[PDB]
UniProtKB/Swiss-Prot annotation:
Its main location: membrane. The chain holds residues 129 to 679 of 679 of the full protein. Residues 1-448 are extracellular. It comes from Mycobacterium tuberculosis (strain ATCC 25618 / H37Rv). It is a single-pass membrane protein. Belongs to the transpeptidase family. Cleaved by Rip1 in response to oxidative stress (H(2)O(2)), prevented by Wag31. Cleavage probably occurs near residues 102-103. This is Penicillin-binding protein PbpB. GO terms for biological process: cell wall organization; peptidoglycan biosynthetic process; regulation of cell shape. GO terms for cellular component: plasma membrane. The enzyme has an N-terminal penicillin insensitive transglycosylase domain (formation of linear glycan strands) and a C-terminal penicillin-sensitive transpeptidase domain (cross-linking of the peptide subunits). It is found in: Cell membrane. Keywords: Cell membrane, Cell shape, Cell wall biogenesis/degradation, Membrane, Peptidoglycan synthesis, Transmembrane, Transmembrane helix. Pathway: Cell wall biogenesis; peptidoglycan biosynthesis. GO terms for molecular function: penicillin binding.
Length: 448
């Protein structure tokens, strides 16, 4: 005769329940899995099988923790432990809803977003559009997203990768935010030709402006100062090409070609974010490093487990990784404020003015990466991954936000363009309001 273990529950950081079991009947007694939020975080949480064991998601990957072990008679029943996630359901719900309507408004194939706690790298929200509902039969949801693209599905970052170049060039003392540069409209590098997204003669962009206006040419000129080895070294320190260990099934490691295999043109591509791929989580994790004064903390979604008696064990914190100094990180945060700076005369406006929130030192970076055309082995001309990653706020980092839009026809808010900045605006602005966070001179992107 068998004594069944009672399945543990999955809850958020404040013990708001995401998944829990109730006892019912039909093989007479039947345990019913409940999902009071429906699709809420179902990309992370997953769903249950007919036998009451995990089918996919954390229900499956932590099944042994959640299922326990059945007793007998004499062996006692080890009931399932409760899993406490780092997620905040309120933030998850808002972000997940905003991700869905950015996908609707923008016409993108898909949208995903990640919010990290800036100091600890804990995952506060992780969402994609079209999230399935685990309270319903999965075979009836082939049109739904059943997985977790934010960790499983790498993409080329494009210009949001320029945080690496910016971090290296400041960390090695090779430039400063105010340095006046001379930036041609194109250069020949590594045997290939790199253009800026707008035609221009030599422009007196500051280093700040190179990243604020997202000059590819300016980025490569600065990267020539870093050199491949210090640049590749910093890619590795920012954690690219390597799984984070976040504790979710199906995490991709992405792809960074090791320096021993680069072609002549590789260095002309990586610093502007093409020729490598990363997940949204890796992307957001890079900006977490700069937000946490240069110390990257690998993100984590399991906060703790609670044993059946009620004793709580915290998850072990991952080891700090210093990427750049605190001084360098603070300088990059300030400089990325220029990305969201507005200028009616155009000259001192970054690529993402709609992402700024007046009253706050928002800092971030836009991205537009060309996707590979699967039929030619070559890049599409008009098919993009759109990215934004930012920090709320530069003077007091609390939240890191990463966003990717898969080839939108419009802005995330539905206006003409291809920008994820309005979605950052909405999320970061709402995060400041709800915590009642309180409120200098304009930055120079372009000299004379
Ligand atoms: C980084 O993402 C850069 N983008 C490109 O170089 C890309 N090939 C591209 C060129 C021209 C387009 O019309 C679209 C993509 C720079 N960063 C982008 C950004 O949004 O920040 C641009 C400013 C578009 S160029
Ligand atoms: Co025995
Ligand atoms: Co030209
Ligand atoms: Co267009
Ligand atoms: Co607004």
């Amino acid at each position: 005769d068998v004594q069944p273990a009672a399945r543990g529950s999955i809850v958020d950081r404040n013990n708001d329940r995401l998944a829990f079991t109730i006892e019912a009947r039909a093989a007479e007694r039947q345990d019913l899995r409940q999902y009071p939020g429906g699709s809420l975080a179902a990309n992370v949480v997953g769903g249950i099988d007919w036998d009451g064991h995990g089918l996919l998601g954390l229900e499956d990957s932590l099944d042994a923790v959640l299922a326990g072990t059945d007793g007998s008679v004499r062996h006692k029943a080890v009931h399932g432990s409760t899993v406490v996630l780092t997620l905040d359901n309120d933030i998850q719900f808002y972000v997940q809803q905003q991700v869905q309507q950015a996908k609707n408004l923008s016409g993108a194939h898909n949208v995903s977003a990640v919010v990290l706690d800036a100091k600890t790298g804990e995952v506060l929200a992780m969402a994609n559009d079209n999230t399935f509902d685990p309270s319903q039969d999965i075979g009836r949801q082939g049109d739904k997203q059943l997985g977790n693209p934010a960790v499983s599905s790498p993409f080329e970052p494009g210009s949001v990768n320029k945080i690496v170049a910016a971090s290296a060039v400041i960390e090695h003392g090779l430039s400063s935010p105010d340095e006046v540069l001379q930036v041609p409209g194109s250069i020949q590098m590594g045997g290939v030709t790199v253009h800026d997204a707008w035609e221009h003669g030599v422009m007196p962009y500051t280093t700040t402006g190179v990243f604020g206006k997202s000059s590819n040419v300016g980025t490569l000129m600065l990267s020539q100062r870093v050199g491949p080895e210090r640049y590749y070294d910093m890619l590795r320190k920012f954690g690219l090409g390597q799984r984070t260990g976040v504790g979710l099934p199906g995490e991709s490691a992405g792809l960074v070609p090791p320096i021993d295999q680069w072609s002549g043109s590789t260095f002309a591509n990586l610093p502007i974010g093409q020729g490598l791929s990363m997940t949204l989580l890796q992307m957001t994790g890079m900006y977490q490093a700069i937000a946490n004064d240069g110390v990257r903390v690998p993100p984590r979604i399991i906060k703790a487990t609670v044993a059946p008696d009620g004793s709580r064990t915290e998850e072990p914190r991952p080891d700090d990784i210093r990427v750049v100094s605190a001084q360098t990180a603070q300088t990059v945060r300030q400089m990325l404020r220029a990305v969201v700076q507005r200028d009616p005369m155009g000259y001192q406006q970054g690529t993402g003015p709609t992402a700024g929130v007046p009253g706050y030192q928002m800092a971030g970076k836009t991205g537009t990466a060309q996707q590979i055309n699967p039929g030619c082995g070559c890049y599409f001309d008009d098919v993009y991954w759109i990215t934004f990653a930012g920090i709320a706020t530069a003077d007091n980092p609390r939240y890191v936000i990463g966003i990717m839009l898969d080839n939108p026809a419009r802005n995330s808010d539905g206006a003409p363009g291809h920008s994820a900045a309005p979605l950052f605006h909405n999320i970061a602005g709402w995060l400041m309001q709800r915590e009642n966070v309180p409120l200098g001179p304009p930055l120079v992107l372009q000299a004379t």
